[PDB]
Amino acid sequence: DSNCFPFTKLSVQAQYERVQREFSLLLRQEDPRSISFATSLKNRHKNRYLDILANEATLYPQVTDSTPYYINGNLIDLDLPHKFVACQAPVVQGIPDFLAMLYEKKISLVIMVTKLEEGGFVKADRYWPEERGSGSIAVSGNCGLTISEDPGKAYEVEDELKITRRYLILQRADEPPHKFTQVQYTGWPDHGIPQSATSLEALLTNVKNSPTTVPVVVHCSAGIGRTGTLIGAYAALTHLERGTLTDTTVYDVVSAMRRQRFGMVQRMEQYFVIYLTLMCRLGVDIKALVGLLN
Amino acid sequence: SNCFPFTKLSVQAQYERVQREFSLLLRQEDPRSISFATSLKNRHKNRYLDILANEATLYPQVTDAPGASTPYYINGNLIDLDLPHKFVACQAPVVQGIPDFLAMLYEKKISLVIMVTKLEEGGFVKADRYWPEERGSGSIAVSGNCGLTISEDPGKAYEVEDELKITRRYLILQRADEPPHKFTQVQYTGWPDHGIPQSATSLEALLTNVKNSPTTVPVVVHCSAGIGRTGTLIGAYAALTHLERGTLTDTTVYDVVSAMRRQRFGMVQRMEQYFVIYLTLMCRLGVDIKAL
């Protein structure tokens, strides 16, 4: 009981139309002229996309503080057990900043929801050692970091889920090493929907089993699209699990994410995916809806 | 002719200035508008994920004469500062790119290589040995199909100057029955990464080597990444060469570093390394240091 989710009572057509209507209303609320993007704007050399900027008020890691590095990213806090860092895939010259952040902040879990390249276009740049390599790569920037494959825990590849788990060790000279897990999900291309519901659930299982003492880092390419869906689904499902799901939960959750990082949930079908994950958790068939989106 | 009003300013005047010049230098180059195409293609030969050689000045490709091409790769760039010597600022080559580096030295008849790093620093590999280490005999075959060999010059043994932390290696590259090519490599091990020389004399000795070297070929300078200590040494060279010829202006230090960054992204990494150029120019002008 306690959960109220009347979305499952609507016909397929009404469900599709309500999602479109809500997403348009969210875009309708966009007003970035009034928002400060000061720090993000002077660091365009490290922005993957010129007009995808991080809000100053929630800029990470600057709001936990001189932070000598820049990631185009924001702290997402929805009054839940986990906070998140939603950020872009760092560009090559921004990778040392990204790794330094992971290291200084002791980040335990990084979730990457894109391939490096999709459809003939670059989405992200590699920041982990390749399997076929020596097991370690280094950055020269920010006084140097080395990132290595964990010698006592090999990379895991889950073919059906399209998930790869990399257990990594970040180190600076004469400082203690820091272990972290990167999880890459390559089965959900930009402009599409996840190939299977199970993969997103597996990602959220990682989130839940990770420590609440540090935020979980999540990125796609610009860090507002698939990244926003993942964080939104987590939030929405937490409400479900604690009996506080309401008819407005998805809209409310996305609205609150948007206040903390402009443009969160970038595409209509990405907003739709949050409803789909709720339905799957509830055991409601999504096949006809998936059909309409394809 | 020498105008350097930097000496006639307060202690917190100078420090304030350098800070702001370097902070200006940090934002000069827009990587979004720079090609790194060949360096990105040769990622497996790069020592660092974040350190890429600019296409426009990539060496030795930048010297090739239209349609002609280069079958090897170094992460290195030609640096021209309108001075008698030119430089190839490059990384310490990785094992996979050692043959390329040695092929470059042989084909371009490089006379002098300056190495401003140890092989390892504090447990981390900074460089890979590309010279023989035998009981003086030393002649080793280089990988690839070329037929390149590198030997210690039988007529002139390695020299170890323990006072200046400098080693001088006289080496020979030889391929087939082509005329062999001699060169000198000078390694300075008293300059930690991201940091400053422990000895002004050691630095001055490297510059003497540079000045005394032939002007008909560029001088190869590498550290680990090939931008920090390498950039500082080249910057110091330039500024001093200006202080010599009497062309030292107020804005000479800024202008050489700005010129270097144009030709290889990121030259002179840390602000402290930018200071060394000012320092070893004031300390040459007999003006007392601060230091920090």
Side-chain angles (χ1 to χ4, degrees), chain A residues 1-131 133-158 161-294, chain B residues 1-2 4-7 10 13 15-19 21-162 164-197 199-210 212-244 246-283 285-288 290-292:
Chain A
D1 327 48
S2 184
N3 284 330
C4 181
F5 198 59
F7 185 85
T8 54
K9 288 196 189 312
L10 301 169
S11 68
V12 182
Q13 188 61 30
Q15 289 174 339
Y16 184 95
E17 287 182 7
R18 167 173 159 174
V19 181
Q20 179 64 81
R21 189 181 66 240
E22 282 176 7
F23 184 77
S24 293
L25 180 63
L26 288 166
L27 297 184
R28 163 82 169 75
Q29 260 79 87
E30 295 187 347
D31 184 14
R33 288 195 301 174
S34 58
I35 309 181
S36 182
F37 294 97
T39 301
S40 189
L41 261 169
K42 69 162 189 176
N43 274 285
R44 53 172 35 195
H45 289 359
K46 290 173 178 170
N47 291 335
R48 185 174 292 279
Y49 302 97
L50 291 189
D51 53 8
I52 310 274
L53 305 178
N55 306 41
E56 190 65 34
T58 60
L59 179 69
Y60 191 84
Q62 288 74 355
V63 296
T64 42
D65 300 351
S66 170
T67 300
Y69 50 76
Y70 168 86
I71 74 155
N72 184 322
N74 298 89
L75 187 60
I76 312 291
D77 180 40
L78 301 152
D79 295 320
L80 298 178
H82 291 88
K83 301 196 183 192
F84 295 87
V85 178
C87 61
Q88 66 175 10
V91 304
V92 168
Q93 306 297 350
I95 286 170
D97 303 69
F98 180 70
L99 298 184
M101 181 272 306
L102 292 183
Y103 184 80
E104 190 230 332
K105 290 302 174 170
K106 307 306 167 195
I107 296 304
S108 155
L109 173 62
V110 170
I111 297 183
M112 176 180 173
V113 192
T114 182
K115 298 190 244 200
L116 293 169
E117 298 179 6
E118 293 176 3
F121 303 95
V122 188
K123 295 289 182 179
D125 288 278
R126 182 171 51 81
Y127 51 86
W128 57 87
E130 283 185 307
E131 280 249 49
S134 75
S136 290
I137 58 183
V139 290
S140 174
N142 296 325
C143 293
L145 293 109
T146 295
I147 178 175
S148 314
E149 180 164 8
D150 191 319
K153 209 169 178 186
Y155 282 4
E156 302 173 2
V157 189
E158 313 291 338
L161 301 184
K162 304 296 204 41
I163 283 171
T164 293
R165 299 193 167 95
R166 303 184 173 96
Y167 306 96
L168 296 165
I169 301 178
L170 270 169
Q171 203 179 355
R172 310 187 88 102
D174 310 329
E175 293 195 35
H178 172 73
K179 296 183 175 184
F180 79 99
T181 307
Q182 186 236 23
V183 185
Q184 183 186 9
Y185 172 41
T186 59
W188 179 13
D190 197 8
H191 299 94
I193 62 173
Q195 286 162 19
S196 66
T198 69
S199 296
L200 223 38
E201 281 286 4
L203 289 188
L204 298 174
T205 288
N206 288 139
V207 168
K208 296 179 223 158
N209 294 359
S210 82
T212 64
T213 48
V214 291
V216 171
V217 169
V218 187
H219 71 96
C220 43
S221 186
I224 59 173
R226 290 167 284 175
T227 288
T229 295
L230 183 52
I231 296 166
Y234 167 82
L237 285 160
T238 301
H239 284 283
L240 184 153
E241 283 172 339
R242 57 179 50 170
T244 43
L245 191 58
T246 70
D247 184 37
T248 63
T249 300
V250 186
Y251 189 83
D252 292 332
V253 157
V254 175
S255 225
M257 287 191 304
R258 269 170 178 254
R259 287 187 284 271
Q260 296 174 76
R261 181 165 170 89
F262 186 85
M264 282 292 264
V265 188
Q266 182 178 20
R267 308 194 200 284
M268 184 277 280
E269 70 278 3
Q270 288 160 359
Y271 180 71
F272 219 134
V273 176
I274 306 165
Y275 279 97
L276 297 180
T277 76
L278 283 172
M279 295 172 75
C280 292
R281 177 66 69 81
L282 289 174
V284 179
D285 202 84
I286 62 164
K287 178 175 298 94
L289 281 182
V290 169
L292 278 183
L293 285 164
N294 290 342
Chain B
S1 272
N2 274 345
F4 211 69
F6 194 85
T7 27
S10 13
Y15 161 79
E16 274 202 348
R17 164 173 170 163
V18 178
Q19 272 227 183
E21 290 176 345
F22 183 70
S23 288
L24 183 58
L25 288 163
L26 285 173
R27 297 196 168 274
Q28 177 187 287
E29 299 293 313
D30 176 5
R32 196 176 190 109
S33 87
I34 296 165
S35 179
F36 293 108
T38 300
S39 206
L40 279 165
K41 184 187 181 174
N42 289 275
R43 218 66 190 276
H44 292 152
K45 296 172 171 173
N46 292 340
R47 183 169 295 277
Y48 294 105
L49 198 62
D50 58 325
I51 307 305
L52 303 178
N54 308 46
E55 199 68 13
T57 52
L58 187 69
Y59 189 93
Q61 283 77 356
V62 67
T63 69
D64 298 332
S69 64
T70 292
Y72 54 78
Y73 166 85
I74 69 158
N75 185 317
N77 297 90
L78 181 61
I79 313 289
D80 189 337
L81 297 176
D82 291 321
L83 296 184
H85 286 95
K86 272 148 66 159
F87 295 93
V88 180
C90 58
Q91 74 179 359
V94 302
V95 159
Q96 275 188 243
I98 272 165
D100 311 64
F101 179 75
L102 296 181
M104 180 270 296
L105 294 185
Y106 179 72
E107 240 125 306
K108 312 258 70 175
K109 312 297 162 221
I110 301 308
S111 289
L112 177 63
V113 176
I114 301 285
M115 176 178 178
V116 197
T117 184
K118 309 157 80 155
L119 291 174
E120 298 198 15
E121 305 181 355
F124 288 84
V125 178
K126 296 302 186 172
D128 288 279
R129 179 172 56 79
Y130 50 81
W131 55 90
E133 230 149 40
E134 307 288 346
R135 270 187 284 293
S137 180
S139 185
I140 57 195
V142 176
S143 298
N145 315 128
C146 32
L148 207 58
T149 282
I150 186 173
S151 305
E152 324 182 15
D153 200 317
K156 199 179 184 179
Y158 287 1
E159 295 172 359
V160 180
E161 268 128 44
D162 191 24
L164 302 110
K165 303 283 201 48
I166 286 186
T167 302
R168 291 189 168 83
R169 300 186 182 93
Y170 307 98
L171 295 159
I172 301 180
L173 289 165
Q174 161 99 258
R175 170 202 282 164
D177 72 326
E178 294 182 3
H181 171 69
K182 299 178 182 245
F183 70 104
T184 307
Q185 191 242 22
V186 189
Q187 183 190 13
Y188 174 42
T189 62
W191 191 342
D193 200 349
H194 325 289
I196 71 181
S199 164
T201 81
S202 287
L203 192 88
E204 292 277 26
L206 296 169
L207 298 173
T208 297
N209 269 114
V210 168
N212 291 338
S213 78
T215 56
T216 58
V217 288
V219 176
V220 171
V221 185
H222 72 87
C223 43
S224 190
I227 53 173
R229 291 167 286 180
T230 294
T232 303
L233 182 129
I234 294 170
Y237 162 77
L240 282 183
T241 303
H242 279 289
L243 174 74
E244 258 73 309
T247 312
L248 182 69
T249 89
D250 182 43
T251 73
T252 279
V253 181
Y254 171 80
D255 285 20
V256 299
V257 178
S258 170
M260 294 190 293
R261 286 196 160 222
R262 189 174 52 79
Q263 301 169 71
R264 172 171 179 88
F265 192 83
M267 292 292 271
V268 185
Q269 288 186 270
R270 305 298 300 181
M271 188 186 295
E272 73 213 76
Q273 296 168 338
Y274 184 66
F275 269 102
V276 168
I277 311 177
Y278 271 106
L279 263 74
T280 83
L281 184 59
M282 287 162 45
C283 297
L285 289 189
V287 170
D288 204 309
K290 343 158 148 62
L292 181 54

